[PDB]
């Protein structure tokens, strides 16, 4: 068919404006507003916002000619996802009261979509990303509600499964897409994004913790685990590379290894040495994943999926120390994986519809498909 992109001058504006108008109407009909630590509480959500917009936004900008789309589409996805997550977390956990904690939780839900979208970025347009944002936020909320109903946990505390849900959802959606690279300056911008994610990831591991000592220990463990991982990553990148050089792309994903590994168990680890051991093991598994997974589409999302599974497994191991609960937690993990896979499949078949005017497979990873550039022939 025609490899020249179809005009979205009627699809994209109507779709986005309708979405925003519906969000405004729902906020009118269902949301309501209403101290000492106002700034302290605002700081955590602000850290999550920096990690979403800047960290994940630039982490996927490493593409030679898709950096514009990566950054701007991540911004758009965050803006849509926070509003929709506010409404949906209101609907599935009760009128919706807008506090800073609810905005923080909506930001976490949006970050799930932002992590998933790295597996599909460069192969989709903005409308498909809108569909992905909506369906993925809905699926994560449904998963949390199902867990809260079955295992009698809090709906908000079920958001700890977000690493593995995002990883497997993105893997499934990328698997459903039609089948098909770096530059120095985009790689440096991606290093900026990766550094911001790595410096603020202790905020990802303790937004849902109320007790101050729990948050303290979680941030301690995340900080030390992330420190060991950076060393294992930059050091072991050479082993897991055919020409024995350090890979910038591998480093960008692998620095977050310890943070992902201790994410679900940071508040439970009692001493920094155990967090450091977990960070080292996560770095070694990242090296092995880089060396092995391409043999058996995105390798970084595959190793992130492995790391999230490892984090849940080490949570299972550590929770026993602090056998029915083992079965219950294995069941929670398997339900999370099953729902992530099924919802990713549904999203993938939705994204394959002709109505979205997806880019031709020859036109992947290219900003000229979506953006205006000068001195180009336009139209027919």
């Amino acid at each position: 068919s025609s490899k020249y992109p179809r005009s979205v001058r009627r699809c994209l504006p109507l779709w986005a404006l309708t979405l925003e108008a519906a969000l405004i109407l729902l906020f009118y009909f269902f949301t309501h507003y209403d101290q000492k630590g106002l700034v302290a509480s605002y700081q955590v959500g602000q850290d999550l916002t920096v990690m979403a917009a800047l960290g994940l936004g630039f982490l996927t900008s490493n593409f030679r000619r898709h950096s514009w789309s990566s950054v701007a589409f991540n911004l758009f996805m965050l803006a849509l996802g926070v509003q929709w997550a506010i409404l949906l977390d209101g609907f599935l956990s009760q009128k919706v009261v807008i506090t800073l904690f609810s905005i923080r939780l909506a930001t976490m839900s949006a970050m799930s979509v932002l992590i998933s979208a790295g597996a599909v970025l460069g192969k989709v347009n903005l409308a498909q990303l809108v569909v992905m944002v909506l369906v993925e936020v809905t699926a994560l909320g449904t998963l949390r509600m199902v867990i809260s109903n079955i295992f009698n946990t809090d709906y908000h505390m079920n958001l700890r499964h977000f690493y593995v849900f995002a990883a497997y959802f993105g893997l499934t959606v990328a698997w459903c897409l039609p089948k098909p690279q770096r530059a120095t300056i985009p790689s440096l911008s991606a290093m900026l994004g990766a550094l911001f994610l790595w410096m603020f990831w202790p905020s990802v591991n303790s937004p849902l913790l109320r007790s101050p000592i729990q948050r303290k220990n979680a941030m301690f463990n995340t900080y030390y685990a992330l420190a060991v991982s950076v060393v294992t990553a930059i050091s072991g990148s050479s082993l897991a590379h055919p020409q024995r050089k350090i890979s910038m792309t591998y480093v960008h994903s692998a620095v977050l290894a310890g943070g992902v590994a201790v994410g679900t168990s940071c508040h439970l680890i009692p001493s920094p040495w155990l967090a450091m051991v977990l960070g080292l093991v996560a770095g070694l598994i990242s090296i092995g994943g880089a060396k092995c997974l391409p043999v058996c589409i995105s390798v970084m999302h595959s190793i992130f999926s492995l790391l999230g599974l490892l984090g849940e497994i080490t949570y299972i191991v550590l929770l026993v120390l602090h056998g029915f609960q083992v079965l219950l937690s294995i069941g929670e993990l398997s339900l999370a994986i099953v729902i992530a896979l099924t919802s990713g499949l549904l999203t993938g078949l939705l994204l394959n519809l002709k109505i979205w005017k997806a880019p031709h497979v020859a036109k992947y990873f290219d900003d000229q498909v979506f953006w205006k550039f000068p001195h180009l022939a336009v139209g027919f």
Partner: protein
């Protein structure tokens, strides 16, 4: 003369030191101050780096202008608040000095690529004087509510810059310029400033908000206004472009118009639905301004605005003032109607008059102004590397 700029910089710094010695004496708002700081120096400076051959001047003159501006604004605002007496310096003084720097940087965006650093020092001094006087008039004489400063910072800075750029009009640049064009990595770098401004704007509108309900509302209303603004700006960029392609000029700037237009109503009880309405209208207005009013201003009114600050700061700032008036109409605030209207009118008029006088001073051929062919070029004032 090549020694005009170092002479003026040294003389201005010595004057700043003397004024601090004469007038100045010696923690919950420090994180918000640092957010505003990042907005001032990383946000605007890298936001203006879209020009392919003016990135050095953009970020560096941003740093220089804002560094002079915080000192001079500290002195002027403190003298106004103390009626010529000695005053102490807290976190609020630093925040307000950063706000004065923001106003000067907004005006800088209008004249970017056509002015010298010396002209920028002069404009910084004069503009901060005018801005601080108008802001004192709004805050203490009118006693209007402008906690996010849609009127006193954004509208003032935009129309001050527009008046200066109108006085500094060059006939040879009306049809365009070969250096006035963006590059790929330049727009990638501009996205950094865009994202930092978007991320930290809730602290911009809530830093000096009254603690309690007002500060919380300033944060929540700014956040949802920006969330709606992003979607509407994306939607309208595609709608005004052939085949609905996105324009990086729109996604770099119009995505931030919600923060500007919600500033007056930030602390007021307008509700998160109302803040999103304001943000959507701001994004639409900003996109429409870039696509239709900027060519009209450049070609017909002979007002060239390099960064389109009229579309990000001027029109959304006016929209924010009108939103404040309307919110006063429907009981969202206890401030008077006439005082909000007078604040808007005084901000715009003072900006225009001060910009006229400042631009008339900047038009003297004593400041090393670039030639028409040398506009939007770093090499006039910088040593430029051989490769990109």
């Amino acid at each position: 003369m090549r020694f005009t700029f170092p002479l003026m910089a040294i003389v201005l710094e010595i004057a700043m030191i003397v004024l601090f010695g004469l007038f100045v004496e010696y923690f919950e708002l420090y994180p918000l101050f640092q957010d505003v700081h990042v907005m001032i120096f990383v946000g605007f400076g890298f936001l203006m780096t879209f020009l392919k051959k003016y990135g050095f001047s953009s970020v560096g003159i941003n740093l220089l202008v804002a560094a002079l501006g915080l000192q001079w604004g500290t002195i002027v605002q403190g003298i106004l608040q103390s009626q010529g007496q000695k005053f102490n310096i807290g976190i609020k003084n630093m925040i307000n000095a950063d706000f004065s720097a923001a106003t000067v940087l907004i005006s800088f965006g209008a004249v970017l690529g056509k002015t010298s650093p010396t002209q920028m020092l002069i404009m910084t001094i004069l503009e901060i004087v005018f801005f601080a006087h108008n802001e004192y008039l709004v805050s203490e004489i009118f006693k209007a509510s402008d906690i996010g400063a849609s009127m006193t910072i954004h509208a003032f800075g935009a129309y001050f810059g527009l008046a200066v750029a109108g006085i500094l009009y060059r006939s040879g640049l009306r049809k365009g310029h070969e250096n006035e064009e963006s590059a790929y990595y330049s727009d990638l770098f501009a996205m950094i400033g865009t994202l930092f401004l978007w991320m930290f704007w809730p602290s911009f509108n809530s830093a000096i908000a009254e603690p309690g309900d007002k500060q919380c509302r300033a944060i929540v209303n700014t956040y949802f206004s920006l969330a709606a603004c992003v979607l509407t700006a994306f939607a309208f960029s595609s709608l005004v472009e052939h085949r609905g392609k996105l324009n990086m000029v729109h996604i770099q700037n119009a995505t931030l118009a919600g923060g500007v237009a919600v500033g007056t109503c930030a602390d007021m009880a307008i509700h998160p639905f109302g803040s999103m309405i304001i943000g959507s209208i701001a994004g639409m207005v900003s996109v429409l301004g870039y696509k239709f009013l900027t060519p009209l201003f450049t070609t017909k009114l002979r007002i060239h605005d390099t960064c389109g600050v009229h579309n990000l700061h001027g029109l959304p700032g006016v929209v924010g003032g009108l939103a404040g008036i309307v919110a006063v109409a429907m009981g969202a605030s206890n401030t008077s109607m006439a005082m909000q209207a007078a604040a808007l009118g005084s901000s715009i008029g003072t900006a225009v008059v001060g910009g006229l006088m400042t631009g008339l001073i900047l038009k003297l051929p004593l400041w090393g102004q670039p030639s028409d062919q040398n506009c939007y070029d770093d090499s006039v004032y910088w040593k430029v590397p051989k490769t990109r």
